[PDB]
Amino acid sequence: PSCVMDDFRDPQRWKECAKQGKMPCYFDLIEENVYLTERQCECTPLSKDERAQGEIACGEDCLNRLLMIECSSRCPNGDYCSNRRFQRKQHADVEVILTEKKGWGLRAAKDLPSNTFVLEYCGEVLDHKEFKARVKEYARNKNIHYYFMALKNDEIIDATQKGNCSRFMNHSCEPNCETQKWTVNGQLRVGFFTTKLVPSGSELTFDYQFQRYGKEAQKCFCGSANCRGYLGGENRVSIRAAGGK
Amino acid sequence: APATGGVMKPHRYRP
Numbered sequence A: 001p002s003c004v005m006d007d008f009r010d011p012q013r014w015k016e017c018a019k020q021g022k023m024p025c026y027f028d029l030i031e032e033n034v035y036l037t038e039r040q041c042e043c044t045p046l047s048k049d050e051r052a053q054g055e056i057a058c059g060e061d062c063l064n065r066l067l068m069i070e071c072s073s074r075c076p077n078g079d080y081c082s083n084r085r086f087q088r089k090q091h092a093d094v095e096v097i098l099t100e101k102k103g104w105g106l107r108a109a110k111d112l113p114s115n116t117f118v119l120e121y122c123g124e125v126l127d128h129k130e131f132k133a134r135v136k137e138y139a140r141n142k143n144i145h146y147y148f149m150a151l152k153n154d155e156i157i158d159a160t161q162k163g164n165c166s167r168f169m170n171h172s173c174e175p176n177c178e179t180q181k182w183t184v185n186g187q188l189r190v191g192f193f194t195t196k197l198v199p200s201g202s203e204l205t206f207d208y209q210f211q212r213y214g215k216e217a218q219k220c221f222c223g224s225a226n227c228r229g230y231l232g233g234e235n236r237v238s239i240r241a242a243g244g245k
Numbered sequence B: 001a002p003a004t005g006g007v008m009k010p011h012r013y014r015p
Ligand SMILES: Nc1ncnc2c1ncn2[C@@H]1O[C@H](CSCC[C@H](N)C(=O)O)[C@@H](O)[C@H]1O
Pocket: A024, A101, A102, A103, A104, A105, A144, A145, A146, A147, A167, A168, A169, A170, A171, A172, A218, A219, A220, A221, A222
């Protein structure tokens, strides 16, 4: 079974597709990070001719791109700025698929060039108090999958209840994606980017570098020759540590 | 207490 991202826009149909096991369980689809408690480049503007020639606005040499900052609407290249991927939701062509043992996952629907933006990891941003509260709730409920992503010291992203299809990217000890933290509007966001050419049909993975606070570690089924056997690796850390101190 | 659980940690890929 597989589904495209558009399938998640229709809740009623998503829900009944889920009853027949045709789509993953329902969660709240959001366009950007939601906080539980709240807290310009020097590119030379492309001519119309360069635009027509296929020149890239704010490409490799953009001072903002280089520091992993997105441009605003006030960018010198304006509409044509190619450095506003997070804000324009310019995700890769990706599908959500049911895997053998890891639950649902992500898969390339087209070839994906190296260093291609895939999706933003959206969710509810928690502080330490909120994180601890949800650690308990998720344990009480006996959740299997976990969706905590460290953003900064007092900010963890939690896509358990709210997020987008990025919450489906499985771990691999030998992955074809990575996280990159991007500054968007003075706020930090995390997004997945490919680390290499990913052929169409290939599953999309990143290395969790998982900080396990659980008593028992989950077994990893990535199937790599360098697989570490478990998510979190050898060590178990405290709750506060996983949570960023 | 928690039987399972953990936090994913962003890092740049390095071979
Ligand atoms: N390589 C792997 N081996 C075993 N389980 C994995 C895995 N990678 C991801 N998972 C599972 O996926 C969770 C991460 S959230 C990823 C989405 C999840 N697969 C789902 O269908 O909802 C983890 O808690 C873990 O249970």
